[PDB]
Amino acid sequence: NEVFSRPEWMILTCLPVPPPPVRPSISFNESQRGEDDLTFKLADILKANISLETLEHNGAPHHAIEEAESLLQFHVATYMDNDIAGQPQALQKSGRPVKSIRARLKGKEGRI
Amino acid sequence: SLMSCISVGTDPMPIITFLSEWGMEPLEDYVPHQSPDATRVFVNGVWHGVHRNPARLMETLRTLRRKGDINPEVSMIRDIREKELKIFTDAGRVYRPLFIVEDDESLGHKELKVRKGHIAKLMATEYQDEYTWSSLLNEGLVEYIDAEEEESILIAMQPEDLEPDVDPAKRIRVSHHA
Amino acid sequence: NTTVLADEFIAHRLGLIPLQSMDIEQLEYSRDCFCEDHCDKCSVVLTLQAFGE
Amino acid sequence: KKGIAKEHAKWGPAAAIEFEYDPWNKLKHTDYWYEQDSAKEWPQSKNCEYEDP
Amino acid sequence: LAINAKTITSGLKYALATGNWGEQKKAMSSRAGVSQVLNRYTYSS
Amino acid sequence: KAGRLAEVNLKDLNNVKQMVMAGSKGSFINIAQMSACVGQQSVEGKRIAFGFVDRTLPHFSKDDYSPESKGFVENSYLRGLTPQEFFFHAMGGREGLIDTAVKTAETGYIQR
Amino acid sequence: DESAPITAEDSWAVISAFFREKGLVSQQLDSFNQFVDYTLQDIICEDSTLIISFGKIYVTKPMVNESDGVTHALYPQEARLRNLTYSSGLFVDVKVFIGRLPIMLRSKNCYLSEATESDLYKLKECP
Amino acid sequence: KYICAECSSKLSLSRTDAVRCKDCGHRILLKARTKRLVQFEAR
Amino acid sequence: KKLMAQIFFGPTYYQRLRHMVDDKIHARARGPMQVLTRQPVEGRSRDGG
Amino acid sequence: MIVPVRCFSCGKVVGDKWESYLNLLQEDELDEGTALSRLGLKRYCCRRMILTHVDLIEKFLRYNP
Amino acid sequence: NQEDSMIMNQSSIDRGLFRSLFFRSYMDQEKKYGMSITETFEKPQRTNTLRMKHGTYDKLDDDGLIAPGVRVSGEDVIIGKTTPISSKRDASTPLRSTENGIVDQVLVTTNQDGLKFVKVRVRTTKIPQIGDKF
DNA sequence: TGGGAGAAGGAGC
DNA sequence: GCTCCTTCTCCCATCCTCTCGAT
RNA sequence: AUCGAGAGG
Numbered sequence A: 001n002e003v004f005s006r007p008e009w010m011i012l013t014c015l016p017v018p019p020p021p022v023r024p025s026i027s028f029n030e031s032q033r034g035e036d037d038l039t040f041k042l043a044d045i046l047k048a049n050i051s052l053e054t055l056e057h058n059g060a061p062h063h064a065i066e067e068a069e070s071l072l073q074f075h076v077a078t079y080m081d082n083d084i085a086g087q088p089q090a091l092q093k094s095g096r097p098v099k100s101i102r103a104r105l106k107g108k109e110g111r112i
Numbered sequence B: 001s002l003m004s005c006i007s008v009g010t011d012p013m014p015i016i017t018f019l020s021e022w023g024m025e026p027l028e029d030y031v032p033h034q035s036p037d038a039t040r041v042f043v044n045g046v047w048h049g050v051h052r053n054p055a056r057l058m059e060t061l062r063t064l065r066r067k068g069d070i071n072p073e074v075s076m077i078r079d080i081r082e083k084e085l086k087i088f089t090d091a092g093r094v095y096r097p098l099f100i101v102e103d104d105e106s107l108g109h110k111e112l113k114v115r116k117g118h119i120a121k122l123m124a125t126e127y128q129d130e131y132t133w134s135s136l137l138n139e140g141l142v143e144y145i146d147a148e149e150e151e152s153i154l155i156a157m158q159p160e161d162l163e164p165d166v167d168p169a170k171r172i173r174v175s176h177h178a
Numbered sequence C: 001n002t003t004v005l006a007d008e009f010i011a012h013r014l015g016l017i018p019l020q021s022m023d024i025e026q027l028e029y030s031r032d033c034f035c036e037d038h039c040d041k042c043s044v045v046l047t048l049q050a051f052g053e
Numbered sequence D: 001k002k003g004i005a006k007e008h009a010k011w012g013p014a015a016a017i018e019f020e021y022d023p024w025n026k027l028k029h030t031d032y033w034y035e036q037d038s039a040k041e042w043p044q045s046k047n048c049e050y051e052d053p
Numbered sequence E: 001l002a003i004n005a006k007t008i009t010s011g012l013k014y015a016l017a018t019g020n021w022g023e024q025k026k027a028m029s030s031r032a033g034v035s036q037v038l039n040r041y042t043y044s045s
Numbered sequence F: 001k002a003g004r005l006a007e008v009n010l011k012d013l014n015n016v017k018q019m020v021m022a023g024s025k026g027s028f029i030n031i032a033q034m035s036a037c038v039g040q041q042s043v044e045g046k047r048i049a050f051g052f053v054d055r056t057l058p059h060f061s062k063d064d065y066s067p068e069s070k071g072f073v074e075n076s077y078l079r080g081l082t083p084q085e086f087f088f089h090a091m092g093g094r095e096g097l098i099d100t101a102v103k104t105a106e107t108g109y110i111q112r
Numbered sequence G: 001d002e003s004a005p006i007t008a009e010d011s012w013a014v015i016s017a018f019f020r021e022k023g024l025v026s027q028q029l030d031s032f033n034q035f036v037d038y039t040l041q042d043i044i045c046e047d048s049t050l051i052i053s054f055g056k057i058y059v060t061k062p063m064v065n066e067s068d069g070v071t072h073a074l075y076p077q078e079a080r081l082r083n084l085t086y087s088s089g090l091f092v093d094v095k096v097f098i099g100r101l102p103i104m105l106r107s108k109n110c111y112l113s114e115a116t117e118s119d120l121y122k123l124k125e126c127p
Numbered sequence H: 001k002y003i004c005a006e007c008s009s010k011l012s013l014s015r016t017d018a019v020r021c022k023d024c025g026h027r028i029l030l031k032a033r034t035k036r037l038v039q040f041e042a043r
Numbered sequence I: 001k002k003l004m005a006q007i008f009f010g011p012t013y014y015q016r017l018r019h020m021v022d023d024k025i026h027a028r029a030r031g032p033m034q035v036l037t038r039q040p041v042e043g044r045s046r047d048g049g
Numbered sequence J: 001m002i003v004p005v006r007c008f009s010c011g012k013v014v015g016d017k018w019e020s021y022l023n024l025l026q027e028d029e030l031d032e033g034t035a036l037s038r039l040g041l042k043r044y045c046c047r048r049m050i051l052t053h054v055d056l057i058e059k060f061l062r063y064n065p
Numbered sequence K: 001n002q003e004d005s006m007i008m009n010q011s012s013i014d015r016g017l018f019r020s021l022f023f024r025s026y027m028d029q030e031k032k033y034g035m036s037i038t039e040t041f042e043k044p045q046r047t048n049t050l051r052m053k054h055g056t057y058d059k060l061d062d063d064g065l066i067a068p069g070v071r072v073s074g075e076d077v078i079i080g081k082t083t084p085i086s087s088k089r090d091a092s093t094p095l096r097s098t099e100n101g102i103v104d105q106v107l108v109t110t111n112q113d114g115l116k117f118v119k120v121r122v123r124t125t126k127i128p129q130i131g132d133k134f
Numbered sequence L: 001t002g003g004g005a006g007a008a009g010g011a012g013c
Numbered sequence M: 001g002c003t004c005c006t007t008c009t010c011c012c013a014t015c016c017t018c019t020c021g022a023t
Numbered sequence N: 001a002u003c004g005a006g007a008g009g
């Protein structure tokens, strides 16, 4: 659609980050608090983006810029879909896979 | 079940050194010719060799197990229609004890090895608070049989069943009396 | 109560003990007595003291 | 405290009150259950000694 | 000295207290159903 | 036919017959199984198969195809079940619990 | 009166003897006892040389390492009440302390296995 | 007002006194029983 | 009065099970809610719906 | 646990017939039925109260506290 | 008694048929949350603590515990403790909302870390009632 | 993880 | 150009409820 | 909160 859906918009250049209500900091028990999975994944996105910015400012060997771009692509892909077939899953500190938005919207326990 | 146990594990080597002395032929010096009526002797799933005249080997192994030389939790299976002798010694096998029936040619029909004297000894030992379960096991009166070995035995439900006006309310028992 | 039985267990067992009641007609009901939880014309007080000597 | 067995069974002084009437089945208030004979399968109560068959 | 005992202890104390029969970093092996809290509602239980 | 012969010759004051006559609970099969014979035990639509080699239980000889050998309970609940018939009845009745916890999900998906 | 055939009643003497010797939870007590006595040493000895070489292993009685205190004996009731762990230290004759193995109750390494009914009542353990 | 499992010292055990017993070196305590009279309905 | 039907009567061994109504009864009147979806929380112990 | 006082089915006191029951069983060598009948327990609702009872209290009395 | 239900004799229930004892054990520790920090088992104050549970604190002793023999019901506080900040926060443990009883025993013990913790056992009788399963 | 689709890539006339 | 043609990737799998653990 | 277990219709 000319107005609502163009092919050029299927490649992400600027990514919207949701407000805190979408990713609240759950505080169970008394002192056992922790940020949401989406907050950690977005922090990883920011780290990868800053890494690419630093490498470009440094004009790092293209063979390292390519690896940094692949890391950014993997992190922004797992952010929206952690169930990609034939690829390793991104894991939290505890060793469990992150709960992407696709996993939040899918299944009998999903939003819908 | 109440009378089901799990094997704990036993060293198979003492069994193997028996077989080589009982007349088995090592798989190295085995040619699949000149011996078509020969049994494949396995141990713990390993085809250790080939042995002829398996009846004597099985008789000797059963005599050893019903005496304590072989661990009573060792299951020995002979399947004639494939000519395979399978001895198992590993751990994790579920077995249950049950009585042993002998021919007892003296008293006509086949009769249980364990008799009322052993029961009297067991009751005296219980009431003496010598003759324990191990004493029954070591005398060949009771044997451990697992699921795989059950495919080569015939079991009678009750001692009265093997024994070779009528209450109408008693349950129907076929008593085919094999 | 140092015993191996619960307080309310013993209370229930005590409540089931048959007590003499030939002259029950002379006592008053607790609901109808201008008294308190214990009295003399509407209740009878008993005491149990036991020690495992 | 004074009380009745309605509030709690601890106040009931009647252990068991056997109650029977018409030992023979004259009034036909009961239809006896039988397999082959109804007079030989049901035991004859003691109070049958006090009424004419 | 020079031997880390905890690796054994905290190992054997974790799976046995959780049921995940393996290290805390592994989730493939038979897990969560190996060690269970003893049911003492009744002697038969 | 055995159950029908039993039910016909049951007196009218029989309490289980009155429940069947009213239709409140119980049926003909209940009369047959509690008074005449439990019947044939079948699992997965077929009679008891040979779990062992050429037999169903270690107490039967091989190559035995008699009805008693493959799960025919000649006894009633009043008379009591023999150990072989008891085990065959347990095998048959376990299927009635599997399709309650396993095959219920295959008909709920249909309705969804 | 010595070789008469058995009746269906006398087999209960055999079953009573079986349950008097084996018990009801022998299928777990005999498996664990094998692990401590034999399997543990086999695991220790197998490929244990860093060519350093581990050797004999010793399993003590269950004990608790009290904070700033002397290590004393631990009984199952004390472990249950204090939220402790019923375990015993393993010392490898490289004898270096390598860890603590939890001990199964009424096993060969448990005190309750060498306790009579009076001792079990004294230890506040149900016989 | 505190009784150890082994022996019954019936110590005081204030803030400073902490958790322990005199006679026996055992580390569990039961804090006696309330002085207030309880009342159960015998039913 | 006598009953026309004689009643099967006798001792039988009965067991009390862990399930009792005082441990199953529940009712919610706008209690606590979740922080993520702002829906009623789950569980009788949590005063949920 | 100790002794079933009274009788759920009827209400007869059977809490004072335990030691006598044990003495009849042991000292007088009578069987359960004759001992139960000699204690005046005619109805089988009272009879089961003393016949089927586990005196666990003794075991609870074997602990130090 | 229709549809697989039963009629139970109320008089027999009054005499002890199927009555039972129910014990529940609550546990509470105090932990360091640091190197030189420690929680305290004490009676919570009304002005110092930063939090409250709206339960009745009139039954706790000086140490923040309830002696055996006190009828604790509903939202009563049984193991009252206050934790500091890193004035004081509230970390008291109340009873279950739908559970009541009498305190049976109170075990005061030291943890393997040397930290004082307390277990409290509450005892209740569950008389058979309409709707109980047999 | 157990069957199914549907889809895809490949051979053959 | 069908003709398939076998070979692959693919998403599923009843409902509601309770309690107790371990992090 | 997460995870897992067990249990009821």
Ligand SMILES: Nc1ncnc2c1ncn2[C@@H]1O[C@H](COP(=O)(O)OP(=O)(O)OP(=O)(O)O)[C@@H](O)[C@H]1O
Pocket (backbone or CB within 6 Å): F100, F101, F104, K004, M014, M015, N009
């Ligand atoms: N897996 C399940 N899925 C859906 N509903 C179930 C499930 N299991 C049980 N139920 C519900 O519970 C009921 C089963 O009742 P229950 O288990 O008491 O057996 P029943 O049919 O009542 O016969 P009985 O009481 O004699 O066993 C069904 O009516 C059903 O609605």
Ligand SMILES: [Zn+2]
Pocket (backbone or CB within 6 Å): C030, C033, C034, C035, C036, C038, C039, C040, C041, C042, C043
């Ligand atoms: Zn008064």
Ligand SMILES: [Zn+2]
Pocket (backbone or CB within 6 Å): H004, H005, H006, H007, H008, H009, H021, H022, H023, H024, H025, H026
């Ligand atoms: Zn002391």
Ligand SMILES: [Zn+2]
Pocket (backbone or CB within 6 Å): J007, J008, J009, J010, J011, J012, J043, J045, J046, J047
């Ligand atoms: Zn009675």
